[PDB]
Design a protein around this nucleic acid. Sequence first.
RNA 1: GGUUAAGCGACUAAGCGUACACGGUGGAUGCCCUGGCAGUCAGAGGCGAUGAAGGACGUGCUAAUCUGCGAUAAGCGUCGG
RNA 2: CCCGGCGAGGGGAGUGAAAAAGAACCUGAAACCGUGUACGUACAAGCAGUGGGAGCACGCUUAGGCGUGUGACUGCGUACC
RNA 3: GUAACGGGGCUAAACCAUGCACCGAAGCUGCGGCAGCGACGCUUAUGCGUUGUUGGGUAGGGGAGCGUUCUGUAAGCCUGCGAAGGUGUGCUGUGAGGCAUGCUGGAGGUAUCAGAAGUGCGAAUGCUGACAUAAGUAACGAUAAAGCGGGUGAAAAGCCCGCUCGCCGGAAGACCAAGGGUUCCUGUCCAACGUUAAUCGGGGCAGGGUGAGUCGACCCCUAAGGCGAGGCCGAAAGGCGU
RNA 4: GACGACGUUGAUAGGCCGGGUGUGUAAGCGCAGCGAUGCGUUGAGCUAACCGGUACUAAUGAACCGUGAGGCUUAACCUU
Lengths: 56, 110
Amino acid sequence: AVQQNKPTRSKRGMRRSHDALTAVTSLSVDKTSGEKHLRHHITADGYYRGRKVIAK
Amino acid sequence: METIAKHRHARSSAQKVRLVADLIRGKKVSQALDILTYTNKKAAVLVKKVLESAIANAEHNDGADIDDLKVTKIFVDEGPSMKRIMPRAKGRADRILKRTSHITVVVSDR
RNA sequence: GGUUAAGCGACUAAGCGUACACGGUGGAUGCCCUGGCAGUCAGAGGCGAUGAAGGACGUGCUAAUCUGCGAUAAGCGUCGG
RNA sequence: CCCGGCGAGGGGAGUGAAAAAGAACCUGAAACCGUGUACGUACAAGCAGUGGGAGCACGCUUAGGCGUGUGACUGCGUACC
RNA sequence: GUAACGGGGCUAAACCAUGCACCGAAGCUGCGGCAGCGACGCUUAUGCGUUGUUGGGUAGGGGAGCGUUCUGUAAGCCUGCGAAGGUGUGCUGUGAGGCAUGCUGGAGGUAUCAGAAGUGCGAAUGCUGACAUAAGUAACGAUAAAGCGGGUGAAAAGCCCGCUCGCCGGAAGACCAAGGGUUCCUGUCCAACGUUAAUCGGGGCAGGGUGAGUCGACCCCUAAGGCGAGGCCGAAAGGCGU
RNA sequence: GACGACGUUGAUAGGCCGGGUGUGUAAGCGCAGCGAUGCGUUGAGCUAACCGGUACUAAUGAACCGUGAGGCUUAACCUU
C-alpha cells in the first residue's frame, strides 16, 4: 500500500524521461493572405486556401 | 552582448513551466515566437510575455537588431510557497502548498 | 589500384552518476539594545459615602487606534520657575 | 524614458562610500531544487567502499615521465545504536 | 530446480605404504620509528650513553591533555593600509587541534600566566522551525441538462440581453420568531479569498439607506420558581422562611 | 501508444439514388351509421448499424527529418 524505502532523485528523473513534449514540425502559408496558419485550419484573419471564408 | 528580462513570483510550479522552456532553448527569436504561439499550455502565455520584453529592451537600451537575436540562456527557479488548510473527513486537517517560480530569459547576438 | 572472403574494430545518450563554476529557496552564525533577572543604600507602608479599585461612552481642523482629559472635556484660574 | 491589461513583474537613467544596502531591505550557513563545462555509462546482478589499474581532459615542465578531475577491467567485503 | 565431491571435470585428479621439493597467517626473522615498567651509570632543578622486557580488550579503576563563553593581567597589544563571522587553498602534530593566506564581509578582537563553568550530541515512537518522498498520482461534494446569436472586455463553456430545452410546485414558492449583526442598495477594483477561468460575487475600497398616539418592547397583573427587613437555626462561611 | 486502408491520376467517411429487411393498411378526401366506429383510395406510410452504385461535401500546392560512394590487417584473386 505504501513504500518501505524513500526513492532516490535519480529514480525520479528516469520516470520523467518520457514527459518531454514535441513542437509543431512546420506551419503552412496561405496562397493569398500570406500569413502562417495551422495546416487544415483557417487563418487568424479568416482565410482558407485563398477563399476569404466568413470572418465575422 | 546580453540582455535580461525576468518575471518573479509567477503563479505556477517550476516543474510545469520547465516543460515549455526546453522547447525554445538555443533557438532564434523569430522561430521561438512561432513555437510558443501554437502550444496549448498556460505556461506558454507566461513565457511569451517575458521573451517579448527582453527583445524590446535590446533596441531601446542596447540598440541591437531583431534579426541577429537568439535565445542563449533560459532557466526557471522555485519561489516562496503559500500555506493553506483543507478539511478532510473525520475532523482531520491537511496542508496545501501553492508554489511559485521565477522565470529568466537572456538574448544575445552570439 | 579493383572484386570476394575471414578476423578485429572507434564515433550514438532518451536519461543517469561524480567533480568544479554560477544561481534560487531558507533564516543559522557573528555583531547590536529604549526589554528582562538578582541585589545594596534610602523613601513611603495604605485608598474609599468629600463616592474607591476597575470599567462603559464621549472629547481635536480629524476616518481609525493609542496617550491625556470629562458637556469648562489633548483643557480653565492663581502663585513661582 | 521603454515592454506590459492606464496591471503584476522587469530593463535603463539618477541618488549614495556601497542598490549582489530597493523597503519580501546588515551579515546570509545546511537540508532541498536548477543552468553550463570535463570524464564515465544501454550483455550486466548484491551495504556501493577499499587495494591494484588502462584510457581521456587539463595545469606544470631547461621533454624532468609529477599534480588535479574522471574510473573500463580485477582481488577482498552482509550499515549504525 | 540438477541439489548427499563448493563447481568444472577425474579411472587418477581415488585409496594404502615410503621419500624428497614447493605454496601457505597480522606467528617467527630483517630494516626504520613511538611509548610503559625495571634494574645499572650516584646520573641529577634529568635527559641519556646505555641495558633487559612489555604494549588485543566490554563492565570498571588509575594517569595525562585539546577546544568553547566569562573575570584579572589590559587606559596594554592588533585593527577602515580592513575586526568577528562565512567560503577555498597550502603547511604542520601521535590525537582532540594549530599556523599562514586569496575571495566575501564592514567594526570590533585579544597574547602570556592564573581563576570560575548553563563547557562538547546521531539516536531517548526527544522539543521548535524549514524542506523532501509517494506525484503532477487520488480528488474537485447528490446522474434536475443543456444548445445557439448579439454585447462588454487584454482574454468569455461560467458575467449582461434575447429565443428554445429541462427541474421543483403541502416547495427547491411567500411572510416571521429564535440566532447572527451591515451579509441590504449604487459606483469602482481583481493581488489574496471562490476546490477551474472570471469582466462576476455574501471578496477589497468609498458613499448612501431603517420616519409610528393605533405593530412590538417598555408599562399595569400574576404561574412554576428566585431573592428576602425583623425572625428561627448553625464552629466561621452560611441554611430556611414571614 | 501500436497495427491496416485511403488523400483528386481519388469510393476513405458522411450525404444522395436503387434494392432488401422490419413493423402491419399513414395523412388528406369520399361513402355508410344518431353515435362510438367500419369500408374504399392501399400491403399503404415510415424504416438505425446491411447489400449494389454515385465526386454533391471534406481528405490543399508546400514545408520538415534522412545525404553526397562508405575503417584497418591478412589470404585467395583482377593479373587460375
